[PDB]
Design a binder for this molecule. Structure first.
Ligand SMILES: NC[C@@H]1O[C@H](O[C@H]2[C@@H](O)[C@H](O[C@@H]3[C@@H](O)[C@H](N)C[C@H](N)[C@H]3O[C@H]3O[C@H](CO)[C@@H](O)[C@H](O)[C@H]3N)O[C@@H]2CO)[C@H](N)[C@@H](O)[C@@H]1O
Ligand SMILES: [K+]
Ligand SMILES: [K+]
Ligand SMILES: [K+]
Ligand SMILES: [K+]
Ligand SMILES: [K+]
Ligand SMILES: [K+]
Ligand SMILES: [K+]
Ligand SMILES: [K+]
Ligand SMILES: [K+]
Ligand SMILES: [K+]
Ligand SMILES: [K+]
Ligand SMILES: [K+]
Ligand SMILES: [K+]
Ligand SMILES: [K+]
Ligand SMILES: [K+]
Ligand SMILES: [K+]
Ligand SMILES: [K+]
Ligand SMILES: [Mg+2]
Ligand SMILES: [Mg+2]
Ligand SMILES: [Mg+2]
Ligand SMILES: [Mg+2]
Ligand SMILES: [Mg+2]
Ligand SMILES: [Mg+2]
Ligand SMILES: [Mg+2]
Ligand SMILES: [Mg+2]
Ligand SMILES: [Mg+2]
Ligand SMILES: [Mg+2]
Ligand SMILES: [Mg+2]
Ligand SMILES: [Mg+2]
Ligand SMILES: [Mg+2]
Ligand SMILES: [Mg+2]
Ligand SMILES: [Mg+2]
Ligand SMILES: [Mg+2]
Ligand SMILES: [Mg+2]
Ligand SMILES: [Mg+2]
Ligand SMILES: [Mg+2]
Ligand SMILES: [Mg+2]
Ligand SMILES: [Mg+2]
Ligand SMILES: [Mg+2]
Ligand SMILES: [Mg+2]
Ligand SMILES: [Mg+2]
Ligand SMILES: [Mg+2]
Ligand SMILES: [Mg+2]
Ligand SMILES: [Mg+2]
Ligand SMILES: [Mg+2]
Ligand SMILES: [Mg+2]
Ligand SMILES: [Mg+2]
Ligand SMILES: [Mg+2]
Ligand SMILES: [Mg+2]
Ligand SMILES: [Mg+2]
Ligand SMILES: [Mg+2]
Ligand SMILES: [Mg+2]
Ligand SMILES: [Mg+2]
Ligand SMILES: [Mg+2]
Ligand SMILES: [Mg+2]
Ligand SMILES: [Mg+2]
Ligand SMILES: [Mg+2]
Ligand SMILES: [Mg+2]
Ligand SMILES: [Mg+2]
Ligand SMILES: [Mg+2]
Ligand SMILES: [Mg+2]
Ligand SMILES: [Mg+2]
Ligand SMILES: [Mg+2]
Ligand SMILES: [Mg+2]
Ligand SMILES: [Mg+2]
Ligand SMILES: [Mg+2]
Ligand SMILES: [Mg+2]
Ligand SMILES: [Mg+2]
Ligand SMILES: [Mg+2]
Ligand SMILES: [Mg+2]
Ligand SMILES: [Mg+2]
Ligand SMILES: [Mg+2]
Ligand SMILES: [Mg+2]
Ligand SMILES: [Mg+2]
Ligand SMILES: [Mg+2]
Ligand SMILES: [Mg+2]
Ligand SMILES: [Mg+2]
Ligand SMILES: [Mg+2]
Ligand SMILES: [Mg+2]
Ligand SMILES: [Mg+2]
Ligand SMILES: [Mg+2]
Ligand SMILES: [Mg+2]
Ligand SMILES: [Mg+2]
Ligand SMILES: [Mg+2]
Ligand SMILES: [Mg+2]
Ligand SMILES: [Mg+2]
Ligand SMILES: [Mg+2]
Ligand SMILES: [Mg+2]
Ligand SMILES: [Mg+2]
Ligand SMILES: [Mg+2]
Ligand SMILES: [Mg+2]
Ligand SMILES: [Mg+2]
Ligand SMILES: [Mg+2]
Ligand SMILES: [Mg+2]
Ligand SMILES: [Mg+2]
Ligand SMILES: [Mg+2]
Ligand SMILES: [Mg+2]
Ligand SMILES: [Mg+2]
Ligand SMILES: [Mg+2]
Ligand code: NA
Ligand code: NA
Ligand code: NA
Ligand code: NA
Ligand code: NA
Ligand code: NA
Ligand code: NA
Ligand code: NA
Ligand code: NA
Ligand code: NA
Ligand code: NA
Ligand code: NA
Ligand code: NA
Lengths: 214, 144
RNA sequence: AACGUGUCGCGAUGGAUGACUUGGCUUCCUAUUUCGUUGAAGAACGCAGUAAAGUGCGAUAAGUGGUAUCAAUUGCAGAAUCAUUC
RNA sequence: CACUGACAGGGAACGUGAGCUGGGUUUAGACCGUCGUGAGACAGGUUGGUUUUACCCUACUUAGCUGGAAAUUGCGAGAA
RNA sequence: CGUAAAAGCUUGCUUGAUUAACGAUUUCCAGUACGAAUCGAGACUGCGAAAGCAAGGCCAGCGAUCCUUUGCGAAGAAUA
RNA sequence: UUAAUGAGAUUCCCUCUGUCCCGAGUUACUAUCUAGCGAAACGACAGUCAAGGGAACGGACUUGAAGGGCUAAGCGGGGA
RNA sequence: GAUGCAUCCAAGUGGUGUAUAUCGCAAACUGAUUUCUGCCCAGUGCUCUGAAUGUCAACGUGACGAGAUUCACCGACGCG
RNA sequence: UAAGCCCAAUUAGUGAUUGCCCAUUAUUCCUUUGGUAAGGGCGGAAACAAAUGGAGAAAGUGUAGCCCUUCCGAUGUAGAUGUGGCCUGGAGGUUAGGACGAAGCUUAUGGCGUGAGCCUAAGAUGGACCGGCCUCUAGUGCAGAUCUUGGUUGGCGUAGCAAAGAUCUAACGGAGAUAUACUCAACAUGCAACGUUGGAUACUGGAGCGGGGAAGGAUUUCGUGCCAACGGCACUCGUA
RNA sequence: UGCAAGGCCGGAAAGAAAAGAAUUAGAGGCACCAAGUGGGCCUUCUUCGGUAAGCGGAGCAGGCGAUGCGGAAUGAACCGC
RNA sequence: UCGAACCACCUAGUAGCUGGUUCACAUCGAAGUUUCCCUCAGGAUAGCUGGUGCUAGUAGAAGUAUUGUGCGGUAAAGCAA
RNA sequence: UGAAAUGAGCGGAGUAUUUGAGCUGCGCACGGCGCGCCGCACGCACUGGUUUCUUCUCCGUGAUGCUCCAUGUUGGCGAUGGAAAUGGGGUGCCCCCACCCGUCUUGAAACACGGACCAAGGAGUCAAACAGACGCGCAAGGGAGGAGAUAUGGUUGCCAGUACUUCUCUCGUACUGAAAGGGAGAUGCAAAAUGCAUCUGUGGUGUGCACACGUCAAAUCCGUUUGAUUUGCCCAACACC
RNA sequence: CAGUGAGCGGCGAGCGAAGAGGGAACGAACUCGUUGCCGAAUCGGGUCUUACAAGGCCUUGAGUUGUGGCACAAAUAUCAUUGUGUGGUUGGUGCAGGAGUGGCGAAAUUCAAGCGAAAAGCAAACCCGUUGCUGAAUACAACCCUUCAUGUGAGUAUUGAGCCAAAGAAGGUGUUAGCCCAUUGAGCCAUAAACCUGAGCGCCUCAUGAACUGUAUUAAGCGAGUAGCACUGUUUGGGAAUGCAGUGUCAAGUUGGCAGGUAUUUGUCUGCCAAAGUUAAAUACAGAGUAGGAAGACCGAUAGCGAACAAGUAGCGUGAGCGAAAGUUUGAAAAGCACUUUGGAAAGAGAGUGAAAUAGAACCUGAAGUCGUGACAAAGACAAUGGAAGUACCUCCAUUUCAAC
């Protein structure tokens, strides 16, 4: 018999299985440990080739979109020119000293820009710029002693110079104020929701009433 | 493992538990969910009522991120408060502050008796939850 | 009696089994790794002292040259040198 | 029709096809009538249309060899 | 099968053949639907002086998904 | 309707005959025996009958009747 | 009667009857000669140098509406 | 004077109420196995060397079952489940064997197990690997699918090798003979079959088993050697 | 103060006498996950169609199928078990 | 090879139909019936069966009697109702 | 063959013991006659009496043994042999049993199909979704996965493993409505279109493990333990709200 | 995310994505057309410079029907003038180191015991043990008893004594090898170009950046039979139409255009700017190749590729195509059986080699089935086989017993 079972929806009706008459359509992961080792080996080789430059270029901090992730922070593509100008860096020169530049990202709030400006300022203070000619050092370029003392970041996210992404600090414990004691939170929230939700109907009803007056 | 299967037990049984009369044929009932309204109707109706038909409005291009709204009740608020803060929390004094959206919750529901009073930062709150938390000595502060 | 039957010992016919494995199958990795009118891939015919197939080679034909190696090849035969290179 | 004393009825896988025969019935060709729009149909008519194998075992028919009464043995002894 | 101051006949008034908050149950039966039923509860009614009696003509006369199509969500009021 | 024509279907007559009454004799090549050579089909196991029951038609079973063993040439009853 | 009929062909300034031209070419039926081949156009087909004709699509024309939409008119082989 | 039919008895008018024979049934005894099993013991009581009473005793589903006592059931197609149940290739562990003989193979080699099977013995077998135990793992167990491949086999020295007429003779050639215990003159104890040459007899009968070509074949042509296989008999012959 | 219903507090209980005055190899209930089967056949009585059938078709219950053993000489279903 | 040639591939095409399906013992052990189905050689679905159990081991026990109390229109009988 | 001889049987002790049968006392039952009279086969109580006949009567051994095995008599055969025995194996023969396997089928020994022999090969597998049973970890939380990180930036290889990390993701802790959207504690006081107060708490009732109070009955080796039951709380569950 | 409380679907069978989040990769960005300002400053071809130079000179040859330069959001002139620089990717010229590639390159017993039987053991955790003890093989060889013969291949085994290890690595060598061989490491040597290295380091040449001060600026534009729209067709989860195609029709840019997953007309808002082009990595290699490596709980000659082998071969088909069988695996070494004898030969009978010839040649092992042979067992005709009980005879089987046992 069949009995009481879930109704199957296994979705395996195509020629996925390799056989005598079908090339199949499959993907296996038997090379996964080897590819992990190769990727790490390539990263170590890349670090050696670009030494002493950091393996990962500097990236800004951005706020994740959508109401589900707006509380989270992560690294973005690149620094906007507005952030770079505020930090005192020409964007074309910044790309030559290991700073990622994104001319697409807007800066719609001061807090969003300020955190990235501080990131650039911290990176600029820690930067050791090798002279093009160690005989005739120009302004901004590093001395010979700093050149020999240079080391390579190599961190996964390239954030040793500036630190991890910064989250807002948790609020400290406190007492309840008198307004919070007596104020009806639900009524305030419901009224605001109803203002938007019934905005169209309320406006039409008022307009119909005004037309009734005239 | 293969050695634990009925096939090992059935070596020498000829019919392997499928019978001499009926036999083990290829597809005696049809393939998959065939005959849901014909010759399998009783199985579908008694075990999966509601399977056939249409119901309700359509929502093209559903995006679950806008609809994100997990809930937590008042009686579960101790899960988001550290033990040391809960011990020092007393009605009418300094209370721990719970940030629901950073904890992964969007609405405070309010089932049961709240154990430790606290200040709760929530996007939404039910009216019963807001009433009970204020009576218990806590508060709810709206957040976004 | 004779054919025929049965058993044991020993033989014949017949190549299973075990042991063996320079093969297959399958999974990974490395890279100044991708042919041709400057005639490719494929097809044909030839080439050894002895040579059917196969392999290698192209009338310079089981190979010429160069580098390294450091006393062979080998069924028979032949062969200056028994050797810093020649 | 004729003879005869008489021309009784039946069975044996409606005896008997590796015994025969193949006229009929029952393929594919073709004609007619009736039927069907048609392809086609008709216990309706018509004409033409491959009948395979025994050397085995029994049975039967003949044809040879040859043991054997404890029906092969017991030495187990019975005379029309 | 049942029925006689009716359940029949005649007649006077009527629209209980409407609605009925997913109440429960019988028949078929897997104790699933569908169709017919039974006992209710609420609304508005009809008849009757009144107890009462009626949500069709007792029990046969009928229909899923999808799709199509019709009815209901009247007007005005609410600082939400 | 039709002369001529037809390995076309049909009926009769003359001639003719082993088609038959009714079988007989002869020949070549076989079969048969030998020398050399040397298969296939087929093969559950096997292989005497009568009746009885039985999947209603047995070589196996029940009860009876037969049955010494091994061979050569035939034969087509059976081996559904 | 070639600006054709039949017709190949996925397609072209493509192909066949056609190197042809009605005493031709293409498509059916019957089946020498002789003697004949009657009646029926209702049906089903085919066909007509028959309508200021009903109906049939797209395109067109006009209109209500903010517009989508909708409506009105026009509309050929074919069928009638 | 039933060994038939109907009735009625159990050794018979004598003294009492079981004539006899056959079950996978009944009763009972022994053993196995499984329970919805029922109980008891498990704090080593004491004592005890050899020369000359013993051994065991596990807190336990399942084993050679911890031991003992007790009671009940036991067949079965399709089917289900269980098994310190059996067996095979490989892996992780552990413990062993083997040139004084591993695997494989052979058996009137016995022993053990209800059984799947395990173990020993012998090889006048073999010549280099391999066993047990716990766990893991899988292309893991064959009697039969008109099953696949290979080999064998009765039929069977059987059916047959019968169209195209037909061959005979001598000599030579050849291992292919005229091939012999005793007896015995040769017959009755080496048969049959051959290649060539010469004779004889016949056939093809010019629309030919005549002489040349195409297609097709491709050395079959020629000479010498040669008889293993092939020319369905034969060959000393041959398109071998 | 009656009736209907849901409870509370007490009482009495041959735990069911006597009169033929029950018996039980009677642990009651509750789930979960699934296999094979869904051609049947026979018989005692009842029984329908058919002249009838080793025919077709039902009821109650046994049996074969799935099962031998001991009997009816022989027989899936009869007798005994 | 023709009432749709041959070759390779899709193709291990599908089959409710036919055939096959490899060790042992042990504890249990059927059904051919119900309803629905283009269903009638097949399935779903209840029943029968195994396994896993759960729950306070006689608790809501019974293919059987007895007593009390209901239900019936077949066998008989009747046509003098 | 006495390695616990439970015996009316074995061992001691004594001529007694009390079963029945006969014969009989009183009362009561029982039977016949119509108030108490007659009978009473010999019933019940006095466990009546008489002992004339018939019997035997009483007492006695725990395991300091948890389990298994181990103790006669008379001959024959066997004194080391190519021996005697018992079991196994092989072949034949007697008497009695016994239809050919597999398969479909109501029914096969079938005049139903596959079935000459042997060897080797030959058929419930792998993957994904779900579910239940059982094992393991953690638990209102569980767990990845991908990817990084370095022991390993090392090593033919062992090392494609093992060890470590995740503000994430996922399944859950909350469910409902077609949706817009709402969203679940108890008690007390009281009935406010969001009522107040308290926070050690099964929402209530019925049935229900263990455990705690007692209480009866059976058995004890007298320590108890085998049942039943009253009350309380009732766990898990089930049923009404 | 997600087999989805998206959607598509005789809404049946089935089908079925996208944004976000954790990550991989990433020095990732550029070119043209247009617009404005310039206007041959460009390209080929000769010729010279060590040079088919990103160079000079020349050239109507191309080209004004427009090559090229400068600026356009990473932006905020160009264009001289002088000084400071830079470019190994401008072309010549020549000097290093490295990587890569190839060649070369390590340890320790052939130690002691000799042969059918001690080149074997026992002393029961550990130790005593660097010690003590010693032999059931006076063997075996086929019915038993004599006599005379015959037989043990190579030590990677055993025991004893040592040794190497930054090397125990797993291949070879006549049995199982760290020390017999090869191997296993540091390291050494040699290099066309290319590759990597203060964009390695110089010279010529050629280009070129920033800072100097003077120097002329704000104005315009940014891709058309294209996008849309109608019909048809196809595709998609995309549903009053996701992408595309044919034809018809065809824009906007002074209320600009496209996207914002229910069609229409409106009004806002958000993101972006189609109809030109280039671009490394993370990804694929589901029947490929070249040069090398690593391997495997895989198969083990009817398996595994069809093919372990003169296999896509022999063979088959007119052809497209089809397509096997087959391990030469004797032995440690050919020592591959001289020689005698019979035979025409093949071979037989002897004799030799070898540890073994029943290892004798495509030869290790040599099963089943079938057959021959010798010995024996019997047996009528019940087809044979089978079951249960005995018995007769046999038995290279097992076990027990042999003295008051
Ligand atoms: N003896 C009767 C038969 O023996 C046969 O088996 C026999 C043989 O297979 C088996 O092999 C024997 C071996 O025993 C004996 N000791 C040595 C002999 N070499 C072997 O014989 C074998 O090798 C020889 C050649 O060497 C061959 O001729 C022979 O065919 C082969 N069977 O010996 C067995 C005798 O016990 C079958 N198993 C069976 O059919 C039957 O019982
Ligand atoms: K079922
Ligand atoms: K955000
Ligand atoms: K059946
Ligand atoms: K006939
Ligand atoms: K035909
Ligand atoms: K004819
Ligand atoms: K639809
Ligand atoms: K003619
Ligand atoms: K008989
Ligand atoms: K005519
Ligand atoms: K037991
Ligand atoms: K146990
Ligand atoms: K079988
Ligand atoms: K034969
Ligand atoms: K010639
Ligand atoms: K031949
Ligand atoms: K070695
Ligand atoms: Mg520099
Ligand atoms: Mg079975
Ligand atoms: Mg099953
Ligand atoms: Mg079935
Ligand atoms: Mg069936
Ligand atoms: Mg709808
Ligand atoms: Mg050659
Ligand atoms: Mg030349
Ligand atoms: Mg040299
Ligand atoms: Mg008849
Ligand atoms: Mg007949
Ligand atoms: Mg015939
Ligand atoms: Mg016949
Ligand atoms: Mg005929
Ligand atoms: Mg005829
Ligand atoms: Mg007919
Ligand atoms: Mg005799
Ligand atoms: Mg005699
Ligand atoms: Mg009335
Ligand atoms: Mg309801
Ligand atoms: Mg009605
Ligand atoms: Mg009615
Ligand atoms: Mg009604
Ligand atoms: Mg004719
Ligand atoms: Mg046959
Ligand atoms: Mg007969
Ligand atoms: Mg027969
Ligand atoms: Mg016959
Ligand atoms: Mg005509
Ligand atoms: Mg005519
Ligand atoms: Mg008597
Ligand atoms: Mg059983
Ligand atoms: Mg395997
Ligand atoms: Mg034998
Ligand atoms: Mg298999
Ligand atoms: Mg086999
Ligand atoms: Mg013959
Ligand atoms: Mg002949
Ligand atoms: Mg002839
Ligand atoms: Mg012939
Ligand atoms: Mg002679
Ligand atoms: Mg002669
Ligand atoms: Mg002639
Ligand atoms: Mg000729
Ligand atoms: Mg010739
Ligand atoms: Mg011949
Ligand atoms: Mg009573
Ligand atoms: Mg009988
Ligand atoms: Mg298949
Ligand atoms: Mg079917
Ligand atoms: Mg079958
Ligand atoms: Mg049972
Ligand atoms: Mg069938
Ligand atoms: Mg009657
Ligand atoms: Mg009556
Ligand atoms: Mg009447
Ligand atoms: Mg006594
Ligand atoms: Mg004894
Ligand atoms: Mg049948
Ligand atoms: Mg059956
Ligand atoms: Mg059968
Ligand atoms: Mg029959
Ligand atoms: Mg059948
Ligand atoms: Mg069949
Ligand atoms: Mg389930
Ligand atoms: Mg839930
Ligand atoms: Mg999910
Ligand atoms: Mg699709
Ligand atoms: Mg994306
Ligand atoms: Mg330009
Ligand atoms: Mg030495
Ligand atoms: Mg001998
Ligand atoms: Mg543009
Ligand atoms: Mg366009
Ligand atoms: Mg591109
Ligand atoms: Mg590895
Ligand atoms: Mg082979
Ligand atoms: Mg192969
Ligand atoms: Mg092959
Ligand atoms: Mg040998
Ligand atoms: Mg004898
Ligand atoms: Mg015997
Ligand atoms: Na079923
Ligand atoms: Na009412
Ligand atoms: Na309807
Ligand atoms: Na009969
Ligand atoms: Na004509
Ligand atoms: Na007409
Ligand atoms: Na007409
Ligand atoms: Na028995
Ligand atoms: Na028992
Ligand atoms: Na009967
Ligand atoms: Na190493
Ligand atoms: Na054999
Ligand atoms: Na033999």
């Amino acid at each position: 018999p069949k009995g009481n079972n879930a109704i199957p929806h296994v979705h395996q009706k195509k020629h996925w299985n390799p056989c005598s008459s079908q090339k199949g359509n499959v993907k296996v992961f038997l090379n996964q440990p080897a590819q992990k080792h190769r990727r790490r080996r390539l990263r170590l080789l890349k670090a050696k080739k670009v030494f002493p430059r950091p393996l990962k270029a500097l990236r800004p901090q951005v706020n994740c979109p959508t109401v589900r992730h707006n509380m989270k922070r992560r690294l973005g593509r690149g620094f906007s020119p507005a952030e770079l100008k505020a930090a005192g860096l020409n964007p074309q020169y910044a790309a030559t000293i290991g700073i990622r530049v994104d001319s697409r990202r807007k800066n719609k709030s001061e807090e969003g820009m300020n955190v990235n400006v501080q990131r650039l300022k911290t990176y600029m203070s820690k930067l050791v710029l090798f002279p093009m000619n160690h005989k005739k050092v120009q302004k901004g370029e590093a001395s010979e002693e700093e050149v020999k003392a240079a080391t390579q970041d190599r961190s996964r996210f390239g954030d040793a110079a500036v630190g991890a992404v910064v989250y807002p600090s948790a609020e400290a414990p406190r007492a309840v104020s008198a307004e919070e004691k007596s104020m009806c939170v639900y009524a305030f929230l419901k009224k605001n929701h109803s203002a938007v939700r019934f905005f169209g109907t309320r406006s039409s009803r008022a307009a119909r009433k005004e037309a009734a007056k005239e | 493992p293969t050695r634990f299967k009925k096939c090992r037990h059935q070596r020498g049984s000829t019919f392997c538990g499928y019978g001499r009369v009926g036999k083990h044929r290829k597809h005696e009932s049809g393939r998959g969910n065939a005959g849901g309204m014909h010759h399998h109707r009783i199985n579908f109706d008694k075990y999966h009522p509601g399977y056939f038909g249409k119901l309700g409005m359509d929502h093209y291009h559903r995006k679950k991120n806008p609809m994100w709204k997990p809930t937590i009740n008042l009686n579960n608020l101790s899960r988001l408060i550290a033990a040391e803060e809960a011990a020092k929390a007393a009605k009418g004094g300094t209370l721990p502050v719970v940030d629901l959206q950073s904890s992964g919750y969007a609405k405070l529901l309010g089932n049961g008796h709240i154990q430790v009073p606290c200040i709760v930062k929530a996007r939404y709150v039910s009216k019963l939850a807001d009433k009970k938390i204020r009576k218990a000595g806590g508060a709810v502060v709206l957040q976004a």
